[PDB]
Amino acid sequence: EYRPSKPSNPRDDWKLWLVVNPGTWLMPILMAVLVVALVVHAFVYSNDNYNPLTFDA
Amino acid sequence: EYRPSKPSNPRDDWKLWLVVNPGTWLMPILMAVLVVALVVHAFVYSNDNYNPLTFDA
Amino acid sequence: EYRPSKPSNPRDDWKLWLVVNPGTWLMPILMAVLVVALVVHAFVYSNDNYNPLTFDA
Amino acid sequence: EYRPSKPSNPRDDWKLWLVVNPGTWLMPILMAVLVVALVVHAFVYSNDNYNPLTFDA
Amino acid sequence: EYRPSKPSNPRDDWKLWLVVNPGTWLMPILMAVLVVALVVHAFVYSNDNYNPLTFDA
Amino acid sequence: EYRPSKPSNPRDDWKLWLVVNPGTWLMPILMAVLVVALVVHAFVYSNDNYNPLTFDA
Amino acid sequence: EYRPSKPSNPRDDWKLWLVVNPGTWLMPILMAVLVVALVVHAFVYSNDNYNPLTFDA
Amino acid sequence: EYRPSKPSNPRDDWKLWLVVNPGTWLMPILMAVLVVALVVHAFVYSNDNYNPLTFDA
Amino acid sequence: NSISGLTEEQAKEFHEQFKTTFTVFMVLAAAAHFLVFLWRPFY
Amino acid sequence: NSISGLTEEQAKEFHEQFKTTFTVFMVLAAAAHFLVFLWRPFY
Amino acid sequence: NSISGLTEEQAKEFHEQFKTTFTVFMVLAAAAHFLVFLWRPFY
Amino acid sequence: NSISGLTEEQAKEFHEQFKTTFTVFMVLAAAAHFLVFLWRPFY
Amino acid sequence: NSISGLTEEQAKEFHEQFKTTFTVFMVLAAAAHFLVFLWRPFY
Amino acid sequence: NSISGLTEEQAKEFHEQFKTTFTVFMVLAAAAHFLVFLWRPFY
Amino acid sequence: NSISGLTEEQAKEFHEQFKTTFTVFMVLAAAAHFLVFLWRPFY
Amino acid sequence: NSISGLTEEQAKEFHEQFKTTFTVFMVLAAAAHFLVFLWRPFY
Ligand code: BCL
Ligand code: BCL
Ligand code: BCL
Ligand code: BCL
Numbered sequence A, B, C, D, E, F, G, H: 001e002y003r004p005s006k007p008s009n010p011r012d013d014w015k016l017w018l019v020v021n022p023g024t025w026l027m028p029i030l031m032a033v034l035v036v037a038l039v040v041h042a043f044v045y046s047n048d049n050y051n052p053l054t055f056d057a
Numbered sequence I, J, K, L, M, N, O, P: 001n002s003i004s005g006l007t008e009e010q011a012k013e014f015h016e017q018f019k020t021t022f023t024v025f026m027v028l029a030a031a032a033h034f035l036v037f038l039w040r041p042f043y
């Protein structure tokens, strides 16, 4: 019966917080972003040509 | 006794949210998709012919 | 004293939801299946003969 | 004081569910069994003689 | 003021369940034991002389 | 309708605690920062030129 | 204002349980000790010389 | 309106427990410290010169 | 008064959708397998 | 009395946004796969 | 008053289904193991 | 009666701050990327 | 008033079953160590 | 009726201390980076 | 009104058992270290 | 009405024991570091 309207983004992006409580999930969000950053660094740093560790002997 | 009707998908897909509370599970869903992308990147990146790290010192 | 009747499967399979709340475990279930698929892909992909990464350079 | 009777197994095996709520722990049990399968597969798969990946490019 | 009596083990071992509810922790206990068996097998299986994988292709 | 005002940072940075309860999340924040430091140390220490382990038998 | 007295250890060690509920944390404590033993075994077992696996061929 | 005063450390360090409940977080703090020591040991132990395992068969 | 809190009708409707979705997933997995066998046979 | 607690309107509205966002994510993923095949072909 | 909250009837009925399911899983695993021994013997 | 319990104004204000912080994070990340390409070009 | 919430009878009787099952697990593990030493001695 | 449940005074007090601690951690980290560059230069 | 909720008697009784068990674990660990040094000396 | 729920006296008493234990842990760690440098010097 009910027919939801088509949402317009990014204008209705704020509605995500109506669904997802920031008090519970904002920190998990930041931690996930950090985990991505760590994983990406791990794959790039593993390449010896893309890390600053250049001390010889 | 009770015999449930055959669901029609994707017309009945919105019913998932009647079972799964998005307030609880939307962020875990996103993080799971993120974990998949990170694993997939790990396997493809690990192959030297499919990552952009082309600098040779 | 009580003697439970022998269940008939798959006819009584829906009773699992009477024990296991899908609102709380459906997403864990699907995440577990995904983990399995990642793990399987990880063992098969690691065989160079069974992945599409064919660029030679 | 109180002296518990010696249990008779497997006839008293159903009493486990009086302690362990299946609604909470049945999915964790199944996931644990799955993890065991995945670890056993990982150790046996890793032996090239015991996996079906037989294609030689 | 209060000075507790010296416990006698294993006679008083049943008092642990007064402290730790089995309904919450029995499954965690079993899962930890399983993890331990898995790690032990990992380390012994890794030794080729102590696993049954003897087929040679 | 309601139009939120553009926040001024770092002046409004304290408002984060109105959303994120420090009693719940301060410890996991610190543990996250510790994990980052462990991961960075792992990558830098792995380079023999950047760890203090200089003894040779 | 209030100035706490210097505690005397190990006479006051029992007060830890007034802070830490053993109902909740005793099993995590024991699991942490188990993890430590596992990690220590993993580092010492990895040394063949400190390994009971002496079967060859 | 409110303008918090500059805290004085370590004089106000006890106030952390007014934010962080020790009953919930003391054990996680202890576990984290243990994890750090295990990781540090892992990186130092891995270097055979800083390793007490000296037996050679 | 079910352990999960679900009524019989809720459990039955959920099971019906779960079975349908599982069946599609299984068909697709079988397709995918046949297809990877065509691309690179195993065993 | 839904299992999740959501009303029908809530579930439908959330699903509508979910679907829209998923569609854009998929279009972008298809774009990225096309670009990565152009850069480094596979199979 | 049980620790888990289950009645005796619920625990018995759950155990009966669990046993049936475990038994089929065990039979299937035994078949898988003879099968894998036929394909690649071990020990 | 929102799912997350937030009011409309709370959600809007949080989103406004989240957007602002995300934008600065974005700008710093783009600057880090150029910068790392200056130091060691990729592709 | 017990920390776990269990009564003395419940604790005793859980402990009696736990000991029973632990003893059988231990006998089985000892048999397994004996068999594995016969198959491949260690030390 | 804040989301976290903190009053404005509590949030401000906690932030003041968090900032102070963070600043000291940062100065310590900067000193450590200077010392490690002295010991083993990078880049 | 303790943080953990335990009475003084409960905390003392638990600590007494914990100390006794810890002492036995430590004695066994010391014996194990002595035996492992006899079997394979370290340092 | 503290965030943690602890009173001022509880927080102070806990901090005093926390400090004391931390100090002993630190002195033991410093002794450990001195002994390990004697056994195998680093840097
Ligand atoms: C590996 C190849 C290159 C390199 C290339 C890149 C590139 C390219 C990028 C980084 C990025 C970063 N790298 Mg790197 N980097 C290298 C070597 C290092 C080393 C090292 C041991 O040598 C370290 C420690 C770092 C560390 C860092 C971080 C400072 C940063 C990722 C932040 C993050 O986790 O966001 C994810 C975590 C979170 C979002 C959680 C929240 C953390 C805080 C709250 C973020 C605050 C946001 C807000 C806008 C801040 C406002 C205040 C500001 C003062 C304005 N790099 C080498 C030299 N690095 C990224 C970056 O700069 O991002 C901005 C980035 O795009
Ligand atoms: C799963 C839990 C819920 C449910 C909740 C949702 C939600 C929530 C959503 C959907 C969405 C969809 N649902 Mg539904 N859905 C359910 C069960 C079903 C059933 C069913 C009979 O069981 C059906 C038919 C559908 C149908 C659909 C689709 C119409 C749609 C997803 C399209 C898609 O991603 O395709 C798959 C397309 C791909 C996988 C593309 C693959 C990318 C390629 C392969 C990349 C590789 C490139 C490389 C070159 C390939 C190599 C070449 C060779 C091929 C190897 N749903 C149950 C009831 N469903 C979404 C939707 O409506 O979006 C508009 C959505 O957001
Ligand atoms: C997802 C959950 C919510 C929601 C919540 C939020 C929140 C919360 C935020 C946004 C934000 C945004 N939202 Mg919204 N949003 C949703 C769904 C949508 C939909 C949609 C139809 O589904 C749309 C169109 C948008 C639109 C947008 C954007 C306007 C904006 C993010 C910009 C951005 O990051 O670009 C992506 C740009 C990049 C990824 C840059 C990548 C960096 C480069 C690529 C580094 C590589 C360098 C190297 C040289 C590259 C190699 C070269 C070759 C290309 C390979 N949202 C749903 C409803 N949205 C943010 C915003 O408004 O910010 C102002 C924000 O904070
Ligand atoms: C590695 C050496 C051999 C091999 C030897 C074996 C052996 C030996 C066994 C398996 C078993 C399994 N193998 Mg293997 N296997 C190989 C390669 C593979 C590959 C692959 C990528 O090549 C895959 C994907 C698999 C997959 C699997 C699963 C189908 C199964 C373990 C299930 C599980 O997780 O149970 C644990 C998880 C759970 C219990 C959770 C619940 C899962 C479901 C819900 C259980 C349903 C039970 C119910 C009674 C089913 C009723 C319906 C039936 C139609 C009757 N094998 C190679 C060829 N494989 C096992 C098996 O068949 O077990 C039955 C087994 O004993």
Ligand code: BCL
Binding pocket: F009, F010, F012, F013, F014, F016, L017, L020, L021, L022, L024, N015, N018, N019, N020, N022, N023, N026, N030, N033
């Ligand atoms: C993120 C969640 C909250 C919030 C909560 C907090 C909290 C809580 C705090 C802050 C803090 C700060 N906030 Mg705020 N903050 C938010 C969003 C913002 C926004 C914004 C527009 O979004 C801004 C501008 C700021 C601004 C700031 C800064 C004034 C300050 C952090 C300084 C800092 O660490 O710099 C970053 C500086 C560095 C990373 C130095 C790095 C050192 C070098 C790089 C190490 C490598 C050395 C090696 C030689 C380098 C190689 C050479 C080449 C460069 C590669 N915040 C949101 C609203 N913010 C802190 C504060 O006030 O402290 C006083 C604080 O405690």
Ligand code: BCL
Binding pocket: D009, D010, D012, D013, D014, D016, K018, K019, K020, K022, K023, K026, K033, M017, M020, M021, M022, M024
């Ligand atoms: C553990 C928690 C609960 C409990 C809950 C449950 C539940 C729940 C179930 C059982 C089940 C069973 N329980 Mg009970 N049970 C408990 C305590 C006990 C005690 C006891 C005295 O403590 C006993 C004797 C039993 C007895 C039993 C069995 C009758 C049955 C499991 C059969 C089985 O899997 O065998 C072991 C069989 C094998 C190990 C198969 C081995 C396959 C081989 C080894 C594969 C390798 C092949 C390869 C070639 C071998 C190589 C050669 C060399 C041998 C190496 N339970 C406690 C109280 N019990 C199940 C049942 O009733 O099923 C009908 C069931 O579902």
Ligand code: BCL
Binding pocket: H009, H010, H012, H013, H014, H016, N017, N020, N021, N022, N024, P018, P019, P020, P022, P023, P030, P033
């Ligand atoms: C963090 C959360 C809380 C808080 C809660 C607590 C708690 C709880 C405690 C403290 C403790 C302390 N707090 Mg306080 N504290 C906070 C914020 C602060 C601030 C601030 C302005 O932010 C300050 C100045 C302090 C000050 C202090 C110190 C007096 C003390 C820790 C000493 C220490 O460990 O030194 C660091 C010393 C070392 C790390 C020694 C390292 C040894 C060497 C380096 C090992 C390597 C050897 C090898 C040879 C080295 C190589 C040579 C070269 C150097 C490389 N706190 C906030 C408010 N604080 C503790 C205390 O009072 O103890 C009595 C304590 O228990």
Ligand code: BCL
Binding pocket: E009, E010, E012, E013, E014, E016, M018, M019, M020, M022, M023, M033, O017, O020, O021, O022, O024
């Ligand atoms: C720990 C938490 C609780 C408590 C809860 C429980 C519970 C619950 C149980 C017990 C059980 C036991 N408890 Mg109690 N227990 C507590 C504290 C104590 C204390 C004490 C003073 O602290 C004591 C003395 C005991 C005593 C005992 C034992 C009688 C018994 C376990 C026997 C066992 O496993 O042996 C150890 C035997 C082995 C480890 C063998 C391992 C196998 C061999 C080593 C395999 C290797 C073979 C290879 C060839 C060896 C190489 C040769 C060289 C030697 C290297 N408990 C506290 C209060 N206790 C159990 C019981 O009564 O069981 C019937 C039981 O289920």
Ligand code: BCL
Binding pocket: G009, G010, G012, G013, G014, G016, O018, O019, O020, O022, O023, O029, O030, O033, P017, P020, P021, P022, P024
């Ligand atoms: C930590 C949280 C609580 C608390 C709760 C508890 C609890 C709970 C217990 C104790 C226990 C003890 N507590 Mg208290 N305790 C606290 C704070 C303190 C403080 C203090 C001033 O902070 C002190 C002095 C003590 C004192 C003590 C000891 C009397 C005792 C532990 C002895 C021990 O393990 O030695 C350490 C001995 C070892 C580490 C030996 C390790 C094995 C060896 C090293 C193996 C290597 C061999 C190899 C050859 C070595 C190589 C040679 C070279 C040396 C390298 N506690 C706080 C308040 N405490 C326990 C107790 O009373 O037991 C009777 C106990 O159960």
Ligand SMILES: CC(C)=CCC/C(C)=C/CC/C(C)=C/CC/C(C)=C/C=C/C=C(\C)CC/C=C(\C)CC/C=C(\C)CCC=C(C)C
Binding pocket: A012, A013, A014, A015, A016, A017, A018, A019, B026, B033, B036, B039, B040, B043, B044, C034, C037, C038, C041, C042, C045, J009, J010, J013, J014, J017, J018, J019, J021, J022, J025
């Ligand atoms: C080599 C190798 C390791 C291969 C692995 C192969 C494997 C296993 C791959 C797995 C592939 C899978 C399996 C991927 C899953 C991808 C996925 C499944 C993506 C889903 C995306 C979803 C979105 C991006 C949607 C987000 C929707 C939002 C955020 C809606 C927010 C709603 C509102 C704001 C409405 C407000 C409502 C009110 C009532 C107020």
